């Protein structure tokens, strides 16, 4: 199908005023004549609600921020549903709601919605009553899970509140006959739930489904005579507000006040009454919030002699590898981790980027020269000549292992532990490799080796969030 109508119409949006509107039953629990304060998603009073029109084709895909309030004048059944979804395309499930005249159909399929989804309407002359509806909503709809059928949801103003909470799609509706001229009325009316579909999909955008007649037909246009009746629908957005819902004796919400709307309503809420006596009341507290953080720490000191091992003018042989202790310094692992000069860099336990935050008691550097074919031996629970007659790693926690090919510098002076010499010929697995193992001592003593601590500029005369040397 999929005839597109949105040729060029690009008028700027118009806002009417949702006076006191879209107050539903935010609860399934009966109340006597009590002034109950509820905190939930609501449409704030006297808010600017956008005003779209049946004519001008007005079916833009709109954002489903937290849940919307949908109102509609429509003396004739011209609004036929909504296509809530995320992408409104394939590869993402979308929700479709449509009612014909005597039945409402709800589907959550992998729809292939059109750019201008709507429903054609036709009246056959033998019986002028069947409004023979044609679907121009989607081209493909397959592989879906939810399908619910009931009596239809629908100057006969109709109001809806859709909200997507924790896998549930909740619909609250209220249909009222209205006499006012064009816009939303003023009388308070409380929406009450229709259904709670366990749809469980993500909804971020939505679009209403129109019913268009075909007034005329040019031979090839498909977009010739789609007259759009005469109606109007308004789309408001639910915001988390606190209300004070006056329940009746019977449990009907006869009135409400919007706490965050203005100081008077806030007072009515905090006093839990619709009438406030003359006086002064305390409602809340003002607090200036911080605008930025300032973190700041001691001033950079001695660096760990990461200045001595990987350099070594000569490395010791693996039969008599060296074990140097390093302590009481700041260990910048970022430089070595960013360095591309290392052929291999395997760390166990902690990612190499978090070592700046972590602290240790001591660190030991096991430095020796091996071959690339023997690099696999530096691992817990490994066997082989090196692991069995030479440096052997424990089965337990290991630190970090660093290796790199050293052909240029080290290619019979190097022996391996009955002792044999490497055939290092300066001409890949037989080239020399230098290996340094970082073993961490994390319990032996109070911590003295730690990463540095990035400082930030200081800002004065503003409420700020600070951290002075741990205070």
């Amino acid at each position, epitope marked *: *199908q*999929c*005839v597109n109508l949105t040729t060029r119409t690009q008028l700027p949006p118009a806002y009417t005023n949702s006076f006191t509107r879209g107050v539903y039953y935010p609860d399934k629990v009966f109340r006597s004549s009590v002034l109950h304060s509820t905190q939930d998603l609501f449409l704030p009073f006297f808010s600017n609600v956008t005003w779209f029109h049946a004519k001008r084709f007005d079916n833009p895909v709109l954002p489903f921020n937290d849940g919307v309030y949908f109102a509609s004048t429509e003396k004739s059944n011209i609004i036929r549903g909504w296509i809530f979804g995320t992408t409104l395309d394939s590869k993402t499930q979308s929700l479709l709601i449509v009612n014909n005249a005597t039945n409402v159909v709800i589907k959550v399929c992998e729809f292939q919605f059109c750019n201008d989804p709507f429903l*054609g309407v*036709y009246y*056959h*002359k*033998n019986n002028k009553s069947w409004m*023979e*509806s*044609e*679907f*121009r909503v989607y*081209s*493909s709809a397959n592989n879906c899970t939810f399908e619910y059928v009931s009596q239809p949801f629908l100057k006969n103003l109709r109001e809806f509140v859709f909200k997507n909470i924790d896998g549930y799609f909740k619909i609250y509706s209220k249909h009222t006959p209205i006499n006012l001229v064009r816009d939303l009325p003023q009388g308070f009316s409380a929406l009450e739930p229709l259904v709670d579909l366990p749809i469980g999909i993500n909804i971020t955008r939505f679009q209403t489904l129109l019913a268009l007649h*075909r007034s*005329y*037909l*040019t*031979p*090839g*246009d*498909s*977009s*010739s005579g789609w007259t759009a009746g005469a109606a109007a629908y308004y789309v408001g957005y639910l915001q988390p507000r606190t209300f004070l819902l006056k329940y009746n004796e019977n449990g009907t919400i006869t009135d409400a006040v919007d706490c965050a709307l203005d100081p008077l309503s806030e007072t009515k809420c905090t006093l839990k009454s619709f009438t406030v006596e003359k006086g002064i009341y305390q409602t809340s507290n003002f607090r200036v919030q911080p605008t930025e953080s300032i973190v700041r720490f001691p001033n950079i000191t001695n660096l760990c002699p990461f200045g001595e091992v990987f350099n070594a003018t000569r490395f010791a042989s693996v039969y008599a590898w060296n074990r140097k202790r390093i302590s009481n310094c700041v260990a910048d692992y970022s430089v070595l981790y960013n360095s591309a000069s290392f052929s291999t860099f395997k760390c166990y336990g902690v990612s190499p980027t978090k070592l700046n935050d972590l602290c240790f008691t001591n660190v030991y550097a096991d430095s020796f020269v091996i071959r690339g074919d023997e690099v696999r031996q530096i691992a817990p629970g490994q066997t082989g000549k090196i692991a069995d007659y030479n440096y052997k790693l424990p089965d337990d926690f290991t630190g970090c292992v660093i290796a790199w090919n050293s052909n240029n510098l080290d290619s019979y002076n190097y022996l391996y532990r009955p002792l044999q010499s490497y055939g290092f010929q300066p001409t890949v697995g037989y080239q020399p490799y230098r290996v340094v193992v970082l073993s961490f001592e994390l319990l032996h003593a109070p911590a003295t080796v730690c990463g540095p601590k990035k400082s930030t500029n200081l800002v004065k005369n503003k409420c700020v969030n600070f951290n002075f040397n741990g205070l």
Partner: antibody, heavy 124, light 105 residues
Framework: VQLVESGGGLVKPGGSLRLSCAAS????????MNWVRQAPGKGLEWVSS????????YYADSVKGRFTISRDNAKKSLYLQMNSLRVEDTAVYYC??????????????????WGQGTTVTVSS | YELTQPPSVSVSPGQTATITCSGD??????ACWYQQRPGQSPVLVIY???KRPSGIPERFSGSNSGNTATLTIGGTQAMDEAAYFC?????????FGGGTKLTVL
């Protein structure tokens, strides 16, 4: 839209063929298509129909179980199977746009965009 | 289902043409009306028994009720000489008429 038919040619009875019908602009999808023949000296007489989604397929009685109409909106063209030929399958074949979407709306429109037909001759 | 049309109708240019379509209980069905001149693909002239697509001149007048559906060309001219086909749908079977035959004298 503008439609062009192709694939019609001489074949002996009992053979096979595949008619073609390509569209002009992507408004192809919004059109239910229909095939109709012209016997070389006779009137319009309907062949079969297929909807915009391709989910109704309805053939004429004289042609049931021979023909399989298929539609691909992505390649934006209409196809008709030939099978097990009559001799009086010989005709010029028209591919025709309804504009309705489903079963229930084909009666409300005329068959209104029409490619220049392709002639199929079925002779021994 | 059947559509019965007179084999031929002859009207002098400038006159009024009239063309029917008979068959069973017809007026409970939308009947389309079809031009096709010799050697050409046809063209619509009526649908839904009273509608005229855009570009269709106002002379191409017709309506349906009862057991016959009619086509009227007021102010006939030399352009008009063509074959005209009645059409209808029967339980989703497109049904074409025999086809009346213009002769613009």
């Amino acid at each position: 839209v503008q439609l062009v038919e192709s694939g019609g040619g001489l074949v002996k009875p009992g053979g096979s063929l595949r008619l073609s019908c390509a569209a002009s602009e992507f408004t192809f999808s919004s059109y239910s298509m229909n095939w109709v023949r012209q016997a070389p000296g006779k009137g319009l007489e309907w062949v079969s129909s297929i909807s915009s989604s391709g989910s109704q397929i309805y053939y004429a009685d004289s042609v049931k179980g021979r023909f399989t109409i298929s539609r691909d909106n992505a390649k934006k063209s209409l196809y008709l199977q030939m099978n097990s030929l009559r001799v009086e399958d010989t005709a010029v074949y028209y591919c025709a746009t309804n504009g309705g979407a489903h079963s229930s709306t084909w009666s409300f429109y005329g068959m209104d965009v029409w490619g220049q037909g392709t002639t199929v001759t079925v002779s021994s | 289902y059947e559509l019965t049309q007179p084999p031929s109708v002859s009207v002098s240019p400038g006159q009024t043409a009239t063309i029917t379509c008979s068959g069973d209980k017809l007026g409970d069905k939308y009947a389309c009306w079809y031009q096709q001149r010799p050697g050409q693909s046809p063209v619509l002239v009526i649908y839904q028994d009273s509608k005229r697509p855009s570009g269709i001149p106002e002379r191409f007048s017709g309506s349906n009720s009862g057991n016959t559906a009619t086509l009227t060309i007021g102010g006939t001219q030399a352009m008009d000489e063509a074959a005209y086909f009645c059409q209808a749908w029967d339980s989703n079977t497109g049904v074409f008429g025999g086809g009346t035959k213009l002769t613009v004298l």
